[PDB]
Amino acid sequence: AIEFNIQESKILKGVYIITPNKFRDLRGEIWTAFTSKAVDKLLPNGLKFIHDKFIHSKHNVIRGIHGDVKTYKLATCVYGEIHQVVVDCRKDSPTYLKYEKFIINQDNQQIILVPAGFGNAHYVTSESAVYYYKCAYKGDYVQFTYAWNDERIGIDWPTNSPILSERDILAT
């Protein structure tokens, strides 16, 4: 019943694309985004996802590009539609500053494992969207941000005028 298609990315080594099964009917849908047994095994030895976060964002909002050298993330969209972007920011990688983009919605329920040393970002195409992500990292008690349109990455976003700040959304 509860199953995962787990595929390594075709272009960015370390990135996994995880698609769950869903029970769908006219009342709605039921699905499992994560189990420890199926998904924590993808992390390095003895690391586990320990944090669950949600970002509810309006139409045309961008979040990112954010990352660091320690935090692994697991990300999807549980309401509406996003364009989810992962950027390889490991300077020694053969795919350094290359990216992969995923259009995630209820009919394309990809869940992206974003490794340490990758930038993370998403853009909301629907009226609003709820972003869901899990976090895993060593060391609890104690980092890079790239501009959404950084020319060196050259991300093909579905807009040229996204909302980046509170002051931007007053205009719309």
Ligand X SMILES: Nc1nc2c(ncn2[C@@H]2O[C@H](COP(=O)(O)OP(=O)(O)O[C@H]3O[C@H](CO)[C@@H](O)[C@H](O)[C@@H]3O)[C@@H](O)[C@H]2O)c(=O)[nH]1
Q: Report the residue number whose CB is nearest to ligand X.
A: 23
Annotated binding residue 63 = yes
Residues with Cβ < 8 Å from 124, sequence gap 6 or more?
Answer: 57, 58, 59, 60, 61, 62, 80, 81, 82
- Dihedral of alpha carbons 55, 59, 63, 65, sign: positive
Closest by Cα among 153, 161, 133 to 60: 161
Using rule CB under 6 A, residue 32 touches ligand X: yes
- Between residue 75 and residue 114, which ones bind a second copy under the rule CB under 8 A? 78-79, 106
Using rule CB under 6 A, residue 96 touches ligand GDP: no
For the bound state, the minimum distance from the C-beta of residue 120 to ligand GDP, rounded and expressed in Å, comes to 10
Tell me which residue has tokens 């960015």.
Answer: 12
Asked whether 16 and 6 are in contact (CB, 8 A), the reply is: yes
Using rule CB under 8 A, residue 66 touches a second copy: no
The encoded tokens of residue 106 equal: 């209820």
- The window from 58-66, 109-117, 133-141, 151-159 that contacts ligand X (CB under 6 A) reads 58-66
Tell me which residue has tokens 């195409």.
Answer: 125
Annotated binding residue 53 = yes
- The window from 8-16, 83-91, 96-104, 159-167 that contacts a second copy (CB under 8 A) reads 159-167
For the bound state, the minimum distance from the C-beta of residue 141 to ligand GDP, rounded and expressed in Å, comes to 34
| Binding residue numbers | 21, 27, 32, 53, 63, 66, 167
